[PDB]
Amino acid sequence: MSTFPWLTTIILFPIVAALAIPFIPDPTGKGRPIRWYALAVGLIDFALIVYAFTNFYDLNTPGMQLWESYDWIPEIGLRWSVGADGLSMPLILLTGFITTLAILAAWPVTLKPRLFYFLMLAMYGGQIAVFAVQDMLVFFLAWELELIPVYLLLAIWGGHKRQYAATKFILYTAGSSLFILVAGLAMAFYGDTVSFDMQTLAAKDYALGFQLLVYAGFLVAYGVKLPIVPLHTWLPDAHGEATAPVHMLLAGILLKMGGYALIRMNVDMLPAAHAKFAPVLVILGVVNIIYAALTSYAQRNLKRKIAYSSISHIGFVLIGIASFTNLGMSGAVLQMVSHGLIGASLFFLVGATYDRTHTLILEEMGGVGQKMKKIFAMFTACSLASLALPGMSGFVAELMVFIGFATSDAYSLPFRVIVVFLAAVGVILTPIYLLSMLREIFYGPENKELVEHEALVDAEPREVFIIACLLVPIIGIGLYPKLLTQIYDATTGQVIARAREVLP
């Protein structure tokens, strides 16, 4: 061990192992020792994640665990302070799981495999660095750590409008991490201490007016990363023009930071401004759901339709954040894990059927399900998981968000009536698009103009293995939610009890 630096090893071991990528011998050029080395590093890091979790993480402790705090730069208060909370540990486990599955799903790449698996391991160490660190300047560092890796994963591999997508992504995310640094420096220079630690910054007492400004800066910075529909248009370009492993860890994990940090430094740090801004967050989550379901329906592209569905499923996260109950916050964390699994399965399957059919337009690709039957089966199962089907993890989080919002007596009664009415029309709208695209992509008679040009080969055993590894925790959490809720029910119980002290 419990004195071993665990989260420092978890963060830095994929980066240090990615520095050994150009020294791996590979005479054939296609990059098979590089993909096996990256899969080995991903599996070893996930094994160390689950070993630290099952030994040195206590499920009944609301405070920070696995705590390390090394002294980086004492002049400015820069410390390497890492820690595993209840808001962090499901996302750390999900990051390890989805990044290992994305490295395994990244196996058809042969364009620049050394650079590809270097960037994927440098995202593996750097995604966990967002959920793990407890210093605000290191939070800004780990937040901006995905600027150049996602740029090069977007711009070299995947898509025809990939350069504009990568450009808009990197400029938009840099202009939002601007506000990350501004709000962190503002709330760390408040009062007569320059402690940059996130617990000490949550322990301060900021006046209102300062809290509203820091919440506005954090809200811009997280409403870009979490897709909030005025600030969401980086996502359909940056996700409709990405390869399937990059899209897997791009909307399975990178949308969850910014949504993890909506709890960490907007609810747990500025509750007096959260109590002022929470009706706006509830309405913006409702508009996320309905708006992105409608734009999912109108998309004739496949990847942009699934990208807009990924925008739609975080509105329940927003409603669960801005509802002041334990079940609402628990359903918000449950949605940011369940949508990670469900979405990553959908992006992998969309990339698989694009690697087979060589087209993204729903007006092509007619009776494709006659030839790839396993891709049809897995795609129907994961699309059903997206529809909030019970027995799968997408329904439980949405039901908990609905119940935890409607029972929240902090809001008025017509507000709760209008919101849970409007949040429930996405229950209609998600089967509409996600079954019209199934009807248009896999069903019907076989498109003979397509099968003459492309080899419609069925799924590999590796792809069936990846979708089964994604669907096992989906069904296992939708059948028994206290597998996951028991990881974070203490800390969220610490958060809501800290955030209900402001409401009248």
Binding site: W72, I73, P74, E75, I76, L78, K112, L115, L137, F140, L141, A142, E144, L145, L147, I148, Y151, L152, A155, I156, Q163, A166, T167, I170, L171, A174, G175, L178, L181, V182, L185, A186, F189, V194
Partner: protein
């Protein structure tokens, strides 16, 4: 006071190195170019090595009120000497490839180095002027050194015009400071002899600020910089963007904190305007530059605005952020100019469009220019991220919120034109690569000076990547050079 000639031993070693390089190229000729770059490298290393015993000394004002050997001047002397060391490591193959002599080039460069190192600590107004015009005249001669090129001749002429005008404006300011303080030329004597703002002190302040911001390349005085960096030899503009700018910032810290510690709000408003509009016009005009040297010129103007953020705050941490950013900016800009040198030596071109597809031909050059340009952009694991982090940390501390917000916004704008070059080298397809990269030579580090090029590139890239996370010895080395600044 009392003469302390043991202070000048870095500059004395460098003057002796200058004389030995010149006498060797007079005795042996062009065949003296086979060993005198390494002798100039050993002389610069000896100057930096003799700066190490001086760091553990008191303030020890050296000549008769004419030189300060404290840690601030020692830091800036080591910075200018390291800039010239990297410049000599870059200009071995490049100067010999143009048919020019390397020894006369190296003596004008070492004269510019001793001029900058004498600017770095200077109390006399006339010593400030003599060292400033040693650096200025050596920079004009280094600018048009490739005199068969029309662009180098034009850059030298319009550099000498602007520099002589700014020198005469600086001299009118220095003459007004000599008259306003009675008859004093030392900067503490001028600070004691005038202690209240008046019309005439503001005039001398703005005249000196114009003569200094010519070297800083602040935005109304930036206009020499794109033409000079497009026209001059590329190691000359590497030295002009690192060592000349560091000498100008040494002059600003030495002058405005010593000669004007009474109109501090006035020159802080002036440098606030300079920083704001320098960041703006340096980071939005580099979006449209299609040459790498002109883009590096406008980016250097933007970096000067970022340094002036920390200069204009006026606290100890602000001066420390300026010093640390100049220190890491040395590494990242010498690495970027080393890659520009190494690409123009093999392709003969400079356009950013001609960098397309370099990833498979020369992977070390793309790794080097990628790491240094992204460090210039502010990308986390590299040095410039931590430099900008310190520049904004000190600047949110003393309430300069608008400057920190503008610096972050123009850094986001800066990311685009740096990532355009990284997109050319790394992202562009093999079927979309340029004509210079299709006809790329075999990578060979054995011609005349490509092995010092590779050594300087590896050293600057290892510095600009590793020394962001190992910055705490650099923070300790910088924050003791700030205690020798008045009013902190």
């Amino acid at each position: 006071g009392q003469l302390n000639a043991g202070t000048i031993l870095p500059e004395t070693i460098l003057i002796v190195t200058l004389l030995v390089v010149l006498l060797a190229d007079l005795i042996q000729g062009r065949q003296a170019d086979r060993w005198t770059p390494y002798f100039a490298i050993v002389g610069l290393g000896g100057a930096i090595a003799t700066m190490i015993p001086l760091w553990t000394q008191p303030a020890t004002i050296s000549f008769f009120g004419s030189f300060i050997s404290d840690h601030l001047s020692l830091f800036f002397r080591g910075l200018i000497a390291l800039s010239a060391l990297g410049t000599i490591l870059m200009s071995i193959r490049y100067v010999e490839q143009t048919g020019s002599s390397l020894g006369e080039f190296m003596t004008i460069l070492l004269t510019a180095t001793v001029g900058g190192m004498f600017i770095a600590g200077a109390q006399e107004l006339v010593f400030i002027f003599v060292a400033l015009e040693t650096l200025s005249i050596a920079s004009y001669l280094l600018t048009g050194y490739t005199k068969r090129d029309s662009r180098s001749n034009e850059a030298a002429l319009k550099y000498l015009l602007i520099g002589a005008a700014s020198s005469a404006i600086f001299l009118y300011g220095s003459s007004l400071l000599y008259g306003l303080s009675g008859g004093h030329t030392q900067l503490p004597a001028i600070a004691q002899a005038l202690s209240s703002e008046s019309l005439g002190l503001v005039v001398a302040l703005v005249f000196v600020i114009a003569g200094i911001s010519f070297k800083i390349s602040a935005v109304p005085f930036h206009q020499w910089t794109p033409d000079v960096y497009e026209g001059a030899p590329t190691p000359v503009v590497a030295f002009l963007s690192v060592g000349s700018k560091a000498a100008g910032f040494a002059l600003a810290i030495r002058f405005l904190t010593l000669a004007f510690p009474s109109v501090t709000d006035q020159w802080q408003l002036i440098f606030t305007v300079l920083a704001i509009l320098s960041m703006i016009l340096g980071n939005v005009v580099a979006l449209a530059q299609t040459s790498m040297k002109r883009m590096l010129a406008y980016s250097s103007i933007g970096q000067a605005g970022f340094v002036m953020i920390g200069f204009v705050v006026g606290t100890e941490a602000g001066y420390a952020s300026m010093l640390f950013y100049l220190l890491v900016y040395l590494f990242m800009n010498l690495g970027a100019f080393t890659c520009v040198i190494l690409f123009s030596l093999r392709t003969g071109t400079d356009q950013i469009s001609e960098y397309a597809g370099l990833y498979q031909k020369d992977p070390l050059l793309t790794l080097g220019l990628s790491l240094c340009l992204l460090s210039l952009g502010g990308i986390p694991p590299l040095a410039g991220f931590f430099g900008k982090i310190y520049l904004f940390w000190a600047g949110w501390q003393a309430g300069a919120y608008g400057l920190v917000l503008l610096g972050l916004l123009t850094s986001v704008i800066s990311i685009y034109y740096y990532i355009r070059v990284v997109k050319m080298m790394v992202v562009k397809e093999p079927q979309e690569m340029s004509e210079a990269v299709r006809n790329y030579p075999e990578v060979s580090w054995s011609s005349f000076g490509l092995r010092p090029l590779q050594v300087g590139l590896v050293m600057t890239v290892i510095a600009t990547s590793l020394a962001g996370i190992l910055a705490n010895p650099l923070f300790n080395l910088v924050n003791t050079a700030v205690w020798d600044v008045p009013q902190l």
